[PDB]
Structure formats: C-alpha cells, structure tokens
Amino acid sequence: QRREMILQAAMQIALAEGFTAMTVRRIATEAQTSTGQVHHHFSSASHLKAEAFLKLMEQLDEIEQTLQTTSQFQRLFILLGAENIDRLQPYLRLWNEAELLIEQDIEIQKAYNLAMQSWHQAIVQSIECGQKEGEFKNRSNSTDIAWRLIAFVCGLEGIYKLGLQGLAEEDFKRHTEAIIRLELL
Amino acid sequence: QRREMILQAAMQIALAEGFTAMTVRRIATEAQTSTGQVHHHFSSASHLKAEAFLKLMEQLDEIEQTLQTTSQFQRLFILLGAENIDRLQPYLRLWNEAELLIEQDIEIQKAYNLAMQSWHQAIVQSIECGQKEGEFKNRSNSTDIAWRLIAFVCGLEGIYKLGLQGLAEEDFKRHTEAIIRLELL
C-alpha cells in the first residue's frame, strides 16, 4: 500500500495547490519517501498526476452519492453542477485545471476523457433510474439525453468564461432546470 | 475609401490564411499601399485584425440572410450552424481561430464578444419572428432561449473537440433539432 500512500500524497497536493505543484520532489517529501520510490511505482510524473486526478474524480462521484436526494430530478442537478456543494469546490477547480492541460499533457488528455465518459454514464444511470421509477418520461433515449445535458452545462459554463455583458452567472441553475424539464419532465 | 481598401485586403488574407499571416507588411503589399498608410489608418496590427474579423462576421450574417427559408425553424438551423453551407467554412474556420486568440489579444477578445452578442441578437430576432408568426410557442422569453441555444451548440462542439469514443459528430443536426423542438416546437 506504499504505492497507494504515494498516490494519496499526490491527491492532497492536487486538491490544495493544483497540478504544477505536483513535482516528484514535492510528492516524495509529502509521502515521506524517496524520489526513487516514486519513480519505481509511477512511469512518469504525468502518469502520477493523471492517476491522482482520476482518483479524485472517482472520489467526487462518491461524495456526490452521499448527498440525500428524494428524486432523480434532484440527483441530476447535483451531477450537472447546479447545486455548488462547498465540499466539491477544490474538486471542480482541479477539473477545470485539467481541462486546460489536455492540450499539452498526453496522460491528462486520456484521463480527462475517461472522467467525461464516467460522468456521462452516471447521468445515463440517473436518467434510466428516473424512467424506471416513473418519474421521467422517455421521449428520447437516455444516452442521447445525457450527452445533450453535458453539452448544455459545459457550453453554458464556456459562455460564462467570456465575460459577456448581458449574461448573469447566477442564472445557471434556472437554465439547467429548464433544460432538464424539457428533456425529461 | 483607401482605408476601406486596406480593410478589404486584410479580410482576404484572414479568410484564406488566418490571423498569423495578417502582418502589416503583408496587408500593405496586398492592398498595394505603404506600411505607413496602414499604420496611419489603424491604431495597431491587432486593431486591424479585429476590425477585419468583425467585418467578415457581419459578412457571414449577410450571406446567411440570403439562404432561402420558409420558416423560422429553418433559419434557426442556419444561424446555429446545423446546415454547414460550404460558402461559410472559411468564415467558421476564422471564428474558431478567433476563439483561441481571445486569451492573448485584447482587441480580438473584445471583437469576439461583440460578435457573440450579435449572434445572440440574431437568434432572438428569429425566435421573436417565429413567435409573432404563430410558428413558435412562448413558454420562455426569447432572450433566455437564445442564450440556451447558443450554449448548447457551443457546448456540443466543445465536446466534439475532445475526441471521445462514443460520440458521433454527424449527430449534431439531430441533437440541435431536438433542442430547438423542445424549446419552441
């Protein structure tokens, strides 16, 4: 589990300071091990960053599954980021940071796509559960709706980054609710 | 109109080769003028690039208004990029190129936002015309729907750029049609 303890040290630095601080020197110091042992367990510094990122993203999904919901409508708001739980703010800060690194880090590029597919599958699962429970309609198939919901929230957050003048960031929940309602009721 | 002829030369280089080729030396040669006259008429090389970009974007809207449509449903597909007119491919190539430059060019940053607002207002106008003509419903206000439609298509195209494995780019029209139908019928 000494490899796991190195990973846990990288995850702490990632959550608190981001990817650039995640040098092998720093991680070895934090895990109280040698840089030689970090290199033994991980093929590259970028492999370690991506593996810690994926662990933190799996951890984000775990945390999200402990918020109490009564409906799949509620769980969709959480999965789509419309509820801004304060616990998850450093997790989302890392996610946005990873999004910028996929254009210069091959391992982070692959890990980001794996996390995207995991996110899509968690939305599919919530949609299909809501349909099975009688809460959601099924005018379109669940895979199509999930990609459209992800596309919407990523696009809306992309437009917020522009700093446009007639667009209030505080409307994100209201817009996301409207789209969820139109797609599923 | 000698200033206008310099602008037209910059627009030709922009459409054919992109922003990096738009040096003052190159534009002066193409407009058959002196670099001194280019500097007289334009405050900076980046001012010239942004002014030519905005002219080409206004030109894209003009071209789009000449495609014959029978419904506002059809015009929305065109405005949202779902119909891939071959004429507009170099215009859209420049638009995506500008999107990358807003993080290092202050004038392109401002011009891109102006074009975004112009795009939003053209969608608002189409929505409100379709509602006035009896073709569209009005469950939400036209400004809200327009931002959501722009957010969707930008988000969908952003997800296409990732190179995910279970996502077919050829589905863009089908997804955009579904969202238009849900928002407006």
Residue numbers in the entry:
A (entry chain A), B (entry chain A): 8 to 192
Give excerpts from the publication.
AmvA abundance in vivo is transcriptionally regulated by AmvR, a TetR/AcrR-like regulator that senses cellular polyamine levels and enables the dynamic modulation of amvA expression in response to fluctuating growth conditions. The AmvR protein can be further divided into two subdomains in each protomer: the N-terminal DNA-binding domain (DBD) and the C-terminal ligand-binding domain (LBD).
Dimerization occurs primarily through hydrophobic interactions between helices α8 and α9 within the LBD. The second and third helices of the DNA-binding domain exhibit a classical helix-turn-helix (HTH) motif, with the recognition helices (α2) playing a pivotal role in sequence-specific DNA binding and being separated by 55.6 Å in dimeric form (measured as the distance between main-chain carbon atoms of His46). Although the majority of ligand-free and DNA-bound TetR/AcrR-like regulators exhibit distances ranging from 35 to 41 Å, suiting the space between the half-sites in the operator, apo AmvR displays longer distances similar to those usually observed in the ligand-bound state. In its ligand-free state, the DNA-binding domains of the AmvR dimer adopt a dimeric arrangement, maintaining their association, but exhibiting a long distance between the two DNA recognition helices, similar to the arrangement observed in the ligand-bound state. Therefore, we speculated that AmvR may have different states in solution, including apo-state and ligand-bound state, but we only captured one state in the crystal.
